[PDB]
Design a protein around this ligand. Structure first.
Ligand SMILES: CSC[C@H]1O[C@@H](n2cnc3c(N)ncnc32)[C@H](O)[C@@H]1O
Ligand SMILES: CSC[C@H]1O[C@@H](n2cnc3c(N)ncnc32)[C@H](O)[C@@H]1O
Ligand SMILES: CSC[C@H]1O[C@@H](n2cnc3c(N)ncnc32)[C@H](O)[C@@H]1O
Ligand SMILES: CSC[C@H]1O[C@@H](n2cnc3c(N)ncnc32)[C@H](O)[C@@H]1O
Lengths: 292, 292, 292, 292
């Protein structure tokens, strides 16, 4: 009971996990990198002292981030990840039998190399001949190449004014950089920060609203992640409709995804996408738009 | 911040709230009592060192516990609360225009008087002329009185083996004590413990399955409670169906409930009662029944 | 075991006391004020989240701050405290039968009023007809009045560049403001911050060295305070010698001080003033002088 | 900072050190073993969840434990350590040019091998040809061998009733086992627990008084150990006097000890052996004697 990892989730609120060990480290100019072996949540990847992915429950975040977008697509073949150095987003994408190519574009080579070696859940993903790793700022990569994609996946940090990832959540990014690189029928999905009853106002509503200014159809959704001590959110965006029944989603999963999902079925997604009264209300009334 | 309340909410997992003050304390034969003034969650009632109700979010637990059961009844008039010394269950029940009598049967008078003295938000509820307070074991109290109720509400602790509340979750209790004290068309609802992706197997699935042995129609549902750092669960049970649309629920809230709910609208209840894949599978495959 | 007061003593080092209650508060523009009722150390006065005085052991700090200076004086009659709003420095001074007048000059009236009411160890001190309370910056008070004193006592915060108390530790303060207000045979004593094996370099050595530039005789000394999690320091300074045997000090205490000291006898002071090898070495080699 | 080692060093009192890592662990029949890499104190050996030796300040404990005893002997040649598996006691003893043989008798081989493997500062000491390691209970080992020593060193745990080390602090042990294994002019020194203003009554005063029943000359002394957040105690005992000046001690260190001590000079020992008022009074009024 003597060693603890502690994080201040919100100020005046601390979440503490008993520690077995501090397994491996790196550090880059971009961020501090650590892998902790924790008692309640297993191995935990921590970046700049912030938990990113815990062994026991990261499947929830990665299944929610990836599967709804691909399943709403009629035939998703090629896909670009903004971020994703941890490798689990890639792992989940690669379970889709329709996928020919996944480009993982992470700014930090140290994250990629670290996780490739030490997040061994992703070992087969990292060695899948369909994966191409690119080391670059994702906005620069997208602007610089002509290739278009069926799905683009944002797996970056929250947009904080003055911060490194903000510019990949702006109206101008989505409109001028992102949409030109989606094929017809293309779907964007991004992680969209906390989506709790109070916490949803921090970035989730703004991301939803910003996407609403650019894409015709925008579907916000959320799920609890125990290790995060909150509900997390994601947003789908597309110029083609995003409206499938629970059973339609299930049929698509059984046909197209190798192995059973552990978190997500069709009903789970329908529930995730039915937000609570107050959260719906904030999203509907939100006027803030991220710009730069 | 200098002052903290710390609770080990699961083995190897600590949840800490910064404190403004420690307001009042009390004690009884059944439990120690404290009211803390916390920074993240306002005033928080703690019983035996376990958080019960926090000012900022107890609305969620109490709206979830109360409103679905009454809204699905054609005309709910009398209601009996097992426990509810804290007073927020009563507060919510008394928001219904159809209600003419609320019996709060809590075993611990010290809890009742403590909250009646110090939980300001329930002052008005405790003084409502429809509210009758009875200090007793709710099982004995139900057996010893022939009166029957349109709704019975379980607001007890989790059924822990050898614990004081266990016996109010057994098949025999439901079948031989509780069911005979429901009027025709009667609805029972109980709090049913943690309903997280892993925590749902502790009691929630067993409470669902136990009620399934006794009532024809049983509807489990859940919602995130920030202050608990988990999803929490409730189960409706009745020998008449419990099936209304979101739109019907919303009309009925407008007709029957004084002022606007803060958490719950019709679609929120639909979402709440659509459990995730793994949770539905546990509930549907469960075989444990609580018996003496 | 649930409520704790925590302080980061040095960074990466936390000292935590179990809390009974948060008894009283104030706040002024100068500082936050709190009285905590702690389990290990009793009642604890905390200013700006920093422990100042704990019930169980503040006698150590106040006996060490006050008694050596007065006892080295042949007949100390009038005495000025820089700071001392907490009242215990005054209490200790007032045990001297030679003392006619104590001036307590604290900048913060809220500290004085708070402690007068709630640090009831000092109740009789605050009501001693010999005490005069002045509310003012001590440097302004000393510069503005002509009255000279037999002993001046610094009971202020550590000198931090840019901070409120720094200017009362400078060479120019001691030389131009302070020494003119000492009578012949006058003794200055000030608290001089941490005096631990590593911590003594922060301010203790600089204070000692600064005093050395102004006063002929300068005697540094230190003692452990359990609640501080360190050795603390004080420095005597005078233009007349400071050299008494342990027995001479004892005889003076029995003659001049009402009641028995609990911490300090003559041998204790001799030991306190014999610093360890490394601390002596830092004090001897120190070249930094506080100036402004 | 995110990772902490926490130890409850007294009831209701927690001392927490930020961690770089958890280096190695081990176990035996007698205790669990861990080596932590801490921010405030460097590498720290922990036995049964209790801090033993920290890299930044263990020099203080080990110089205090060893050097006074040898310096007061005219010519100390052979020495027996009760415990000392950690190796720093040996390290210090081996700094003396007069020493020809050091017996380290520790009951736990796992402690010995753990520290011999992982405590770098003692590598050289463990490989010194004067050092002999014996794995045994030091009481049995002393009884079973007729060899006598110029100095015996107690480096054990505190005598706790019903504990493994209790029997190595009793009058009968000292009188019938230890005293017959001291050569004429022999000196015993033992660690003697906490020696704080309040903590000195736990064992320090009883260890002093017990030794007083058996040896003609007994000298208690103490020093602050930052990592322990307390003053610690040792007691010298001999049938010849233990009385040298600071100047004599310093000359003898120059003559006999390789390189400069970091903590201890002659005046430091004088200060150490001049206890404060309340501590001297406890030691001098004590009547408990440790007996079987
Ligand atoms: C905590 S951020 C999650 C991931 O996004 C990566 N990242 C941050 N900024 C960018 C960017 N501009 N383009 C691509 N990846 C990024 C980080 O290296 C990390 O792996
Ligand atoms: C935290 S338990 C919730 C409430 O249930 C009450 N309680 C516990 N057991 C029973 C019982 N058998 N009957 C009625 N109330 C109970 C407690 O006093 C508390 O206020
Ligand atoms: C923690 S500082 C200790 C005391 O010194 C007081 N103090 C701080 N600055 C000054 C000053 N310049 N003159 C007199 N008292 C002061 C504070 O109000 C507090 O009571
Ligand atoms: C923390 S106890 C200090 C050392 O004493 C050792 N020890 C405990 N009891 C005895 C004993 N009876 N004889 C010798 N060493 C002991 C332990 O293994 C440890 O290394």
């Amino acid at each position: 009971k003597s060693c603890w990892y502690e994080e201040e989730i919100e100020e005046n609120l601390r979440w503490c996990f008993a520690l077995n060990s501090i397994l491996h480290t790196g550090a880059s100019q971009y961020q501090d990198i650590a892998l902790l072996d924790t008692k309640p949540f297993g191995k935990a990847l921590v970046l700049d002292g912030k938990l990113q992915s815990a062994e026991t429950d990261e499947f929830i975040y990665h299944e929610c981030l990836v599967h709804p977008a691909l399943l709403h697509h009629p035939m998703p073949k090629n896909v670009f990840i903004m971020g994703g150095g941890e490798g689990s987003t890639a792992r989940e994408l690669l379970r889709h039998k329709t996928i020919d190519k996944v480009v993982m574009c992470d700014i930090d080579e140290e994250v990629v190399e670290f996780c490739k070696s030490y997040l061994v859940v992703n070992k087969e993903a990292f060695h899948d001949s369909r994966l191409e790793v690119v080391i670059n700022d994702a906005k620069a990569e997208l602007e610089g190449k002509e290739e278009k994609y069926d799905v683009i996946v944002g797996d970056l940090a929250d947009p904080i004014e003055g911060g490194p990832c903000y510019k990949l959540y702006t109206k101008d990014f989505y409109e001028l950089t992102l949409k030109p690189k989606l094929k017809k029928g293309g779907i964007f999905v991004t992680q969209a920060g906390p989506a709790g009853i109070f916490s949803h106002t921090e970035v989730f509503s703004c991301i939803y609203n910003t996407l609403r200014q650019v894409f015709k159809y925008v579907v916000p959704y959320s799920a609890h992640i125990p290790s995060y001590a909150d509900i997390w959110g994601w947003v789908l965006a597309s110029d083609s409709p995003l409206d499938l029944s629970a059973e339609e989603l299930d049929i698509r999963m059984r046909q197209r995804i190798i192995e059973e999902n552990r978190y997500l079925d069709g009903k789970t997604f329908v529930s995730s996408s039915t937000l609570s009264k107050a959260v719906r209300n904030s999203l509907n009334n939100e006027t803030h738009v991220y710009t730069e």
